[PDB]
């Protein structure tokens, strides 16, 4: 009995029990009900990787319960950890590719509209699986049995380089760029709303036609700018039409009628502009929270594993520090495998249409 061993067993059991049925249901809904799109392919691949990773959790529990003693042949001892590493690398690369695609669809929309299809998604998923198998090959090669394991530095170095540094950096950069672009769009919308409001504040008490028409032209320019940021388009068209009517009324020397037409804009403003501004703010808050939670979960799940993998080479196993690292390696791998259960709750279960399909499925 050992507290780290019991903790690892409990974490693995909870991960399995919370991941297997959920991932199974998500995969079933995405395969049998959801239409065949690119995001559907990504979700299917992620759920398949998570299911293949969770199916070996009983084997990990059986191995840990025997206190390392593996009576089976060398075949399983070389196969199952290689399969675990394969699933982990596949999931990491799939998440990185999903982040890259979500960044590219906002960065260059024309290139994605003209090139992004299902064939490219299948090809990049195949390339991801090939790279994962290449990274898994040395695990299956160097593993040997009784205690299943090894008897190494460059392997851990290239693993930290390819599987942890570059994917995490790419994901962080993509999420940061998306957040910055969304915040810039919200700032532009808020500036347009402020230019619409501050000039009406003086139009409501103006006493000259030149300032009125200048402020109305500024309002029209701000509305045309915000239109490129559905009932939204109809409301902006009505707003621009009423602004044009106010301009036509002001050019004829009617200052009071122009002020009345400008004050009439408050109805459609409070009807459409405020509602859509609140909707955009809520959407930005939601996507920012989602990105932050995903990044935090990925870091918490994949940082201690690589930290301990690096420290294993800089610490002698005979020293008490090496024994402590070897004992907590189980907890580290359990926390890393918990990401396989945390994946569907942060990628697939957030879509509104997907949530509705999953609810109607039950």
């Amino acid at each position: 009995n050992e507290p780290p061993v019991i903790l690892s067993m409990v974490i693995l059991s909870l991960t399995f029990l919370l991941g297997l049925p959920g991932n199974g249901l998500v995969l079933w809904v995405a395969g049998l009900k959801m239409q065949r799109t690119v995001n559907t392919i990504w979700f299917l691949h992620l759920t398949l990787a998570d299911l293949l990773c969770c199916l070996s959790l009983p084997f990990s529990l059986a191995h840990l319960a025997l206190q390392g003693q593996w009576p089976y042949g060398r075949f399983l001892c070389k196969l199952i950890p290689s399969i675990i590493v394969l699933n982990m690398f596949a999931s990491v690369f799939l998440l990185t590719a999903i982040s890259l695609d979500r960044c590219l669809v906002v960065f260059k929309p024309i290139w994605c509209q003209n090139h992004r299809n299902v064939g490219m998604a299948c090809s990049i998923c195949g390339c991801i699986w090939v790279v994962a198998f290449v990274m898994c090959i040395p695990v299956f090669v160097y593993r040997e049995i009784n205690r299943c394991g090894y008897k190494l530095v460059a392997i851990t170095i290239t693993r930290l380089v390819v599987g942890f540094l570059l994917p995490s950096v790419i994901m962080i950069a993509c999420y940061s760029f998306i957040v910055f672009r969304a915040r810039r769009q919200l700032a532009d919308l808020e500036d347009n709303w402020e230019t619409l409001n501050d000039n009406l504040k003086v139009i409501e008490k103006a006493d000259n036609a030149a300032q009125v028409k200048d402020a109305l032209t500024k309002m029209r320019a701000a509305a045309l700018d915000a239109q490129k940021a559905k009932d939204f388009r109809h409301g902006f068209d009505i707003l621009v039409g009423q602004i044009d009517d106010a301009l036509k009324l002001a050019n004829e020397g009617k200052v009071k009628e122009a002020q009345a037409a400008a004050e009439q804009l408050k109805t459609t403003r409070n009807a459409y502009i405020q509602k859509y501004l609140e909707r955009a703010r809520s959407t930005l808050s939601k996507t920012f929270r989602v990105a932050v939670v995903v990044v935090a979960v990925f870091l918490v799940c994949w940082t201690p594993y690589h930290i301990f993998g690096v420290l294993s080479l800089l610490t002698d196993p005979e020293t008490p520090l090496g024994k402590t690292l070897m004992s907590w390696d189980h907890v580290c791998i359990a926390l890393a495998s918990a990401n396989s259960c945390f994946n569907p709750f942060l990628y697939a279960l957030l879509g509104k249409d997907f949530r509705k399909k999953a609810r109607q499925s039950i």
Partner: antibody
Amino acid sequence: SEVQLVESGGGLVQPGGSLRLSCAASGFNVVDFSLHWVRQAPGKGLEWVAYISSSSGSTSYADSVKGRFTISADTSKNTAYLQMNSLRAEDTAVYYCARWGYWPGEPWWKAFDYWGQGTLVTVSS
Amino acid sequence: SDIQMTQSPSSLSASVGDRVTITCRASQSVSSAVAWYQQKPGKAPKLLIYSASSLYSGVPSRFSGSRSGTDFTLTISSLQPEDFATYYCQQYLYYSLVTFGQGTKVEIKR
């Protein structure tokens, strides 16, 4: 045929006096597209002159032509008319007629998709 | 007051096949309400690009437009013996806000 705009007010005049430029459209109805005028001096750039709305009645003129020119339209024969008075040496240019659309739709964002033949208005003196 | 427009490339020389860049600046926010026109000596002008983002029908795809804040850029990838003419820019934010640029002329080097 396609959209075509023809002018018939070309010629020479005296300092001041009066002149009437005509703009006939073919291939579309003038009740649904607004007609404007653009000047172009020989060896100079373009300059907006005036705007007439057939289905709205509102008119507009440039800052340098207010109180001197008049613009109108006729939906019977689909013809625009520009009455110019008190002409000077600055008004000697080639007038061009164009059509810009209405905001409820795509033709608004479109540029001057069809230009006229151009009518030369010069002051003899 | 009227929205002023300044066009720095009044005249530039280039060769056949070379790229041409034309920059334009507005007085205040126009919201991409700037179009381009091509006029040959002795003929009526014709449009090539509207809103600095969409290409009009019948116009070759060599011309492209870009917008950055209040600045506009017209790019020609490769010149042809049939497009050497004058280029003008027009603001069409409103009916009573039409304003034209100074014009851009192109010539062939020898």
